[PDB]
Amino acid sequence: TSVKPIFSRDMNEAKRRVRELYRAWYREVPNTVHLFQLDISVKQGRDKVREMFKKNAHITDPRVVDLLVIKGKMELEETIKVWKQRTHVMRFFHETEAPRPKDFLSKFYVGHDP
Protein backbone atom coordinates (compact mmCIF):
# COMPACT_ATOMS: atom_id res chain seq x y z
CA THR A 1 0.00 0.00 0.00
CA SER A 2 3.05 2.25 -0.39
CA VAL A 3 2.52 5.13 -2.83
CA LYS A 4 4.36 8.31 -3.76
CA PRO A 5 2.92 11.40 -2.02
CA ILE A 6 1.95 14.59 -3.83
CA PHE A 7 2.49 17.08 -1.01
CA SER A 8 0.89 15.79 2.17
CA ARG A 9 2.21 12.66 3.85
CA ASP A 10 -1.03 12.11 5.79
CA MET A 11 -4.51 13.53 6.25
CA ASN A 12 -3.46 15.89 9.05
CA GLU A 13 -1.01 17.68 6.76
CA ALA A 14 -3.55 17.58 3.93
CA LYS A 15 -6.17 19.22 6.15
CA ARG A 16 -3.81 22.09 6.94
CA ARG A 17 -3.51 22.85 3.23
CA VAL A 18 -7.30 22.71 2.93
CA ARG A 19 -7.74 25.31 5.66
CA GLU A 20 -5.15 27.61 4.11
CA LEU A 21 -6.98 27.37 0.78
CA TYR A 22 -10.32 28.03 2.45
CA ARG A 23 -8.90 31.12 4.14
CA ALA A 24 -7.51 32.41 0.84
CA TRP A 25 -10.86 31.85 -0.88
CA TYR A 26 -12.83 33.38 1.99
CA ARG A 27 -10.75 36.57 1.95
CA GLU A 28 -10.81 36.91 -1.86
CA VAL A 29 -14.62 36.85 -2.24
CA PRO A 30 -15.15 40.54 -1.32
CA ASN A 31 -12.61 41.59 -3.96
CA THR A 32 -14.10 39.27 -6.57
CA VAL A 33 -17.61 40.65 -6.07
CA HIS A 34 -16.22 44.16 -6.55
CA LEU A 35 -13.73 43.66 -9.40
CA PHE A 36 -16.13 41.52 -11.44
CA GLN A 37 -19.13 43.75 -10.59
CA LEU A 38 -21.14 40.72 -9.53
CA ASP A 39 -24.81 41.02 -8.60
CA ILE A 40 -24.39 38.50 -5.76
CA SER A 41 -23.73 39.46 -2.17
CA VAL A 42 -20.46 38.72 -0.42
CA LYS A 43 -22.45 36.32 1.75
CA GLN A 44 -23.63 34.46 -1.35
CA GLY A 45 -20.08 34.30 -2.66
CA ARG A 46 -18.79 32.88 0.61
CA ASP A 47 -21.75 30.53 0.95
CA LYS A 48 -20.89 29.16 -2.50
CA VAL A 49 -17.25 28.72 -1.49
CA ARG A 50 -18.30 26.85 1.64
CA GLU A 51 -20.63 24.66 -0.42
CA MET A 52 -17.82 23.69 -2.78
CA PHE A 53 -15.57 22.66 0.11
CA LYS A 54 -18.31 20.73 1.91
CA LYS A 55 -19.21 18.37 -0.94
CA ASN A 56 -15.63 17.03 -0.70
CA ALA A 57 -15.77 16.45 3.07
CA HIS A 58 -15.76 12.64 2.88
CA ILE A 59 -12.34 12.25 1.22
CA THR A 60 -9.86 10.25 3.28
CA ASP A 61 -7.05 9.91 0.71
CA PRO A 62 -4.36 12.57 1.28
CA ARG A 63 -3.36 12.32 -2.38
CA VAL A 64 -6.91 13.05 -3.53
CA VAL A 65 -7.10 15.94 -1.07
CA ASP A 66 -3.80 17.22 -2.43
CA LEU A 67 -5.17 17.27 -5.98
CA LEU A 68 -8.37 18.97 -4.83
CA VAL A 69 -6.29 21.72 -3.23
CA ILE A 70 -4.03 21.98 -6.28
CA LYS A 71 -7.09 22.50 -8.47
CA GLY A 72 -8.56 24.88 -5.91
CA LYS A 73 -5.42 27.00 -5.98
CA MET A 74 -5.46 27.15 -9.78
CA GLU A 75 -9.10 28.21 -9.70
CA LEU A 76 -8.19 30.94 -7.21
CA GLU A 77 -5.26 32.09 -9.36
CA GLU A 78 -7.55 32.45 -12.38
CA THR A 79 -9.96 34.54 -10.30
CA ILE A 80 -7.43 36.74 -8.48
CA LYS A 81 -5.51 37.55 -11.67
CA VAL A 82 -8.71 38.21 -13.64
CA TRP A 83 -7.98 35.53 -16.20
CA LYS A 84 -11.61 34.52 -15.71
CA GLN A 85 -14.29 36.84 -17.01
CA ARG A 86 -17.61 37.56 -15.33
CA THR A 87 -19.21 34.58 -17.09
CA HIS A 88 -16.65 32.16 -15.63
CA VAL A 89 -17.18 33.39 -12.07
CA MET A 90 -20.97 33.19 -12.35
CA ARG A 91 -20.88 29.62 -13.68
CA PHE A 92 -20.86 28.42 -10.06
CA PHE A 93 -24.42 29.66 -9.59
CA HIS A 94 -26.32 28.07 -12.52
CA GLU A 95 -28.62 31.06 -12.86
CA THR A 96 -30.36 29.91 -16.07
CA GLU A 97 -30.79 26.22 -15.16
CA ALA A 98 -34.35 25.64 -14.00
CA PRO A 99 -34.33 23.30 -10.97
CA ARG A 100 -34.49 19.63 -11.84
CA PRO A 101 -37.17 17.66 -9.95
CA LYS A 102 -35.76 15.56 -7.11
CA ASP A 103 -38.61 13.50 -5.68
CA PHE A 104 -39.67 10.27 -7.37
CA LEU A 105 -43.06 11.52 -8.55
CA SER A 106 -41.79 14.69 -10.21
CA LYS A 107 -39.09 12.73 -12.04
CA PHE A 108 -41.70 10.12 -12.98
CA TYR A 109 -43.97 12.75 -14.54
CA VAL A 110 -41.37 14.39 -16.78
CA GLY A 111 -39.34 11.50 -18.18
CA HIS A 112 -37.59 8.17 -17.77
CA ASP A 113 -34.36 9.22 -16.08
CA PRO A 114 -33.85 7.76 -12.57
Binding site: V3, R63, M74, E78, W83, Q85, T87, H88, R91, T96
Partner: protein, 206 residues
Protein backbone atom coordinates in the same frame (compact mmCIF):
# COMPACT_ATOMS: atom_id res chain seq x y z
CA UNK B 1 8.99 -4.68 -54.77
CA UNK B 2 7.46 -1.32 -55.68
CA UNK B 3 4.64 -1.16 -53.12
CA UNK B 4 6.48 -2.47 -50.02
CA UNK B 5 8.46 -0.09 -47.83
CA UNK B 6 12.13 -1.16 -47.90
CA UNK B 7 13.84 -2.31 -44.74
CA UNK B 8 17.04 -0.71 -43.41
CA UNK B 9 19.12 -3.27 -41.53
CA UNK B 10 22.09 -0.93 -40.96
CA UNK B 11 19.94 1.47 -38.94
CA UNK B 12 18.21 -1.39 -37.13
CA UNK B 13 21.55 -2.72 -35.84
CA UNK B 14 22.89 0.70 -34.84
CA UNK B 15 19.76 1.52 -32.85
CA UNK B 16 19.69 -1.94 -31.26
CA UNK B 17 23.32 -1.52 -30.21
CA UNK B 18 22.66 1.92 -28.74
CA UNK B 19 19.63 0.50 -26.94
CA UNK B 20 21.82 -2.00 -25.12
CA UNK B 21 24.35 0.78 -24.49
CA UNK B 22 21.73 2.89 -22.72
CA UNK B 23 20.40 -0.05 -20.72
CA UNK B 24 23.87 -1.10 -19.55
CA UNK B 25 24.63 2.41 -18.32
CA UNK B 26 21.30 3.06 -16.54
CA UNK B 27 20.22 -0.35 -15.22
CA UNK B 28 18.58 1.33 -12.22
CA UNK B 29 15.77 2.74 -14.36
CA UNK B 30 15.54 0.99 -17.74
CA UNK B 31 12.83 -1.68 -17.79
CA UNK B 32 12.64 -2.48 -21.52
CA UNK B 33 14.32 -1.53 -24.80
CA UNK B 34 12.89 -2.27 -28.23
CA UNK B 35 13.39 -1.27 -31.85
CA UNK B 36 10.42 -1.17 -34.21
CA UNK B 37 10.42 -2.71 -37.68
CA UNK B 38 10.57 0.84 -39.11
CA UNK B 39 13.63 1.56 -36.93
CA UNK B 40 12.53 3.65 -33.97
CA UNK B 41 14.26 3.08 -30.64
CA UNK B 42 12.11 3.13 -27.50
CA UNK B 43 13.45 3.13 -23.94
CA UNK B 44 10.90 2.17 -21.30
CA UNK B 45 11.91 3.37 -17.84
CA UNK B 46 10.68 3.47 -14.28
CA UNK B 47 9.15 6.91 -13.59
CA UNK B 48 11.88 7.63 -11.02
CA UNK B 49 14.40 7.68 -13.86
CA UNK B 50 12.93 10.60 -15.80
CA UNK B 51 15.47 13.24 -14.75
CA UNK B 52 18.55 10.95 -14.70
CA UNK B 53 17.70 9.22 -17.99
CA UNK B 54 16.81 12.43 -19.83
CA UNK B 55 19.87 14.21 -18.43
CA UNK B 56 22.12 11.36 -19.57
CA UNK B 57 20.64 11.39 -23.07
CA UNK B 58 20.98 15.18 -23.33
CA UNK B 59 24.50 15.48 -21.91
CA UNK B 60 26.36 12.22 -22.61
CA UNK B 61 28.90 12.50 -25.40
CA UNK B 62 27.60 9.44 -27.29
CA UNK B 63 24.00 10.70 -27.01
CA UNK B 64 23.70 14.51 -27.21
CA UNK B 65 19.92 14.46 -27.64
CA UNK B 66 19.78 18.23 -27.32
CA UNK B 67 16.27 18.76 -28.72
CA UNK B 68 13.00 17.65 -27.13
CA UNK B 69 10.84 17.08 -30.20
CA UNK B 70 7.63 16.30 -28.31
CA UNK B 71 6.30 15.28 -24.92
CA UNK B 72 2.81 13.83 -24.66
CA UNK B 73 0.70 11.22 -22.87
CA UNK B 74 -1.48 8.27 -23.85
CA UNK B 75 -4.44 7.06 -21.79
CA UNK B 76 -4.84 3.28 -21.61
CA UNK B 77 -7.61 2.57 -19.05
CA UNK B 78 -7.01 -1.19 -18.86
CA UNK B 79 -3.58 -0.62 -17.29
CA UNK B 80 -3.08 -0.13 -13.57
CA UNK B 81 -0.98 2.91 -14.53
CA UNK B 82 -3.26 4.22 -17.25
CA UNK B 83 -1.08 7.14 -18.40
CA UNK B 84 1.96 6.51 -20.59
CA UNK B 85 4.31 9.50 -20.75
CA UNK B 86 6.27 9.73 -24.00
CA UNK B 87 9.39 11.82 -24.64
CA UNK B 88 10.58 12.12 -28.25
CA UNK B 89 14.14 13.43 -28.46
CA UNK B 90 16.36 14.45 -31.35
CA UNK B 91 20.16 14.33 -31.53
CA UNK B 92 21.54 16.66 -34.19
CA UNK B 93 25.11 15.47 -33.62
CA UNK B 94 24.28 11.87 -34.51
CA UNK B 95 21.27 12.61 -36.74
CA UNK B 96 19.16 10.23 -34.68
CA UNK B 97 15.92 10.08 -32.72
CA UNK B 98 14.96 8.24 -29.55
CA UNK B 99 11.75 7.75 -27.60
CA UNK B 100 11.62 7.47 -23.80
CA UNK B 101 8.45 6.18 -22.15
CA UNK B 102 7.34 5.96 -18.53
CA UNK B 103 3.99 5.65 -16.76
CA UNK B 104 1.84 7.09 -13.99
CA UNK B 105 -1.71 6.99 -12.65
CA UNK B 106 -4.16 9.67 -11.56
CA UNK B 107 -2.65 10.29 -8.12
CA UNK B 108 1.10 9.79 -8.70
CA UNK B 109 3.18 12.86 -9.65
CA UNK B 110 5.87 12.76 -12.31
CA UNK B 111 9.00 14.84 -11.92
CA UNK B 112 8.95 17.87 -14.21
CA UNK B 113 11.63 17.80 -16.91
CA UNK B 114 11.84 21.59 -17.32
CA UNK B 115 15.30 21.40 -15.69
CA UNK B 116 16.50 19.17 -18.55
CA UNK B 117 14.60 20.77 -21.46
CA UNK B 118 13.02 24.20 -21.21
CA UNK B 119 10.76 23.06 -24.05
CA UNK B 120 9.04 20.73 -21.56
CA UNK B 121 7.31 23.65 -19.80
CA UNK B 122 4.24 24.00 -22.02
CA UNK B 123 4.11 20.31 -22.96
CA UNK B 124 3.70 19.34 -19.31
CA UNK B 125 1.01 21.99 -18.89
CA UNK B 126 -0.79 20.43 -21.86
CA UNK B 127 -0.48 16.96 -20.33
CA UNK B 128 -1.84 18.32 -17.05
CA UNK B 129 -4.72 20.02 -18.85
CA UNK B 130 -5.68 17.22 -21.23
CA UNK B 131 -4.87 14.19 -19.06
CA UNK B 132 -4.70 15.42 -15.46
CA UNK B 133 -1.19 14.15 -14.81
CA UNK B 134 0.51 16.28 -12.16
CA UNK B 135 4.14 17.25 -12.73
CA UNK B 136 6.11 17.97 -9.57
CA UNK B 137 8.25 21.10 -9.27
CA UNK B 138 6.85 22.67 -12.43
CA UNK B 139 7.55 26.43 -12.50
CA UNK B 140 3.92 27.19 -13.39
CA UNK B 141 1.52 24.26 -13.72
CA UNK B 142 -1.94 25.31 -14.88
CA UNK B 143 -4.35 24.73 -17.74
CA UNK B 144 -3.20 25.95 -21.15
CA UNK B 145 -5.77 24.78 -23.73
CA UNK B 146 -9.14 24.42 -22.01
CA UNK B 147 -11.50 27.21 -21.03
CA UNK B 148 -11.13 28.76 -17.59
CA UNK B 149 -12.96 26.75 -14.96
CA UNK B 150 -13.26 23.75 -17.28
CA UNK B 151 -13.80 20.56 -15.28
CA UNK B 152 -12.24 17.27 -16.29
CA UNK B 153 -9.47 16.23 -18.63
CA UNK B 154 -10.84 15.86 -22.15
CA UNK B 155 -8.24 13.53 -23.68
CA UNK B 156 -8.99 10.71 -21.22
CA UNK B 157 -10.68 7.80 -22.99
CA UNK B 158 -13.62 7.99 -20.57
CA UNK B 159 -14.27 11.69 -21.17
CA UNK B 160 -17.16 12.04 -23.65
CA UNK B 161 -16.41 13.47 -27.07
CA UNK B 162 -18.86 16.36 -26.71
CA UNK B 163 -18.19 16.97 -23.02
CA UNK B 164 -20.75 17.73 -20.35
CA UNK B 165 -21.56 21.43 -20.78
CA UNK B 166 -22.16 23.75 -23.72
CA UNK B 167 -22.25 27.53 -23.97
CA UNK B 168 -24.76 30.03 -25.29
CA UNK B 169 -25.62 33.68 -24.81
CA UNK B 170 -28.56 34.25 -22.48
CA UNK B 171 -30.44 37.52 -22.78
CA UNK B 172 -32.01 37.47 -19.30
CA UNK B 173 -28.62 37.54 -17.55
CA UNK B 174 -26.87 39.37 -20.42
CA UNK B 175 -23.89 37.02 -20.57
CA UNK B 176 -22.64 33.72 -21.92
CA UNK B 177 -23.84 30.84 -19.75
CA UNK B 178 -22.90 27.17 -19.44
CA UNK B 179 -25.58 24.48 -19.48
CA UNK B 180 -25.70 20.68 -19.71
CA UNK B 181 -25.07 19.61 -23.28
CA UNK B 182 -27.98 18.57 -25.49
CA UNK B 183 -27.44 17.73 -29.16
CA UNK B 184 -30.01 18.17 -31.91
CA UNK B 185 -28.28 15.22 -33.59
CA UNK B 186 -26.42 12.75 -31.40
CA UNK B 187 -23.04 11.65 -32.69
CA UNK B 188 -23.61 8.33 -34.44
CA UNK B 189 -21.32 5.62 -33.07
CA UNK B 190 -20.00 3.27 -35.76
CA UNK B 191 -18.87 -0.31 -35.20
CA UNK B 192 -16.30 -0.66 -37.97
CA UNK B 193 -14.00 -3.46 -36.81
CA UNK B 194 -14.05 -6.55 -38.97
CA UNK B 195 -14.59 -9.82 -37.05
CA UNK B 196 -11.72 -11.42 -39.01
CA UNK B 197 -8.12 -11.10 -37.85
CA UNK B 198 -5.98 -8.88 -40.08
CA UNK B 199 -2.40 -9.31 -38.82
CA UNK B 200 -1.33 -12.80 -37.68
CA UNK B 201 2.13 -11.51 -36.73
CA UNK B 202 0.62 -9.60 -33.78
CA UNK B 203 -1.76 -12.32 -32.56
CA UNK B 204 -1.78 -12.41 -28.78
CA UNK B 205 -1.38 -15.86 -27.17
CA UNK B 206 -4.73 -17.05 -25.74
Amino acid sequence: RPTVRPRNDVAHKQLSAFGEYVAEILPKYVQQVQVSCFNELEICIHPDGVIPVLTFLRDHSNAQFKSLADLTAVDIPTRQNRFEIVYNLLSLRFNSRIRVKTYTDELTPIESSVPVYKAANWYEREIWDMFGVFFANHPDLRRILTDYGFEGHPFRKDFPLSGYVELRYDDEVKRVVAEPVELAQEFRKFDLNSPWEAFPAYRQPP
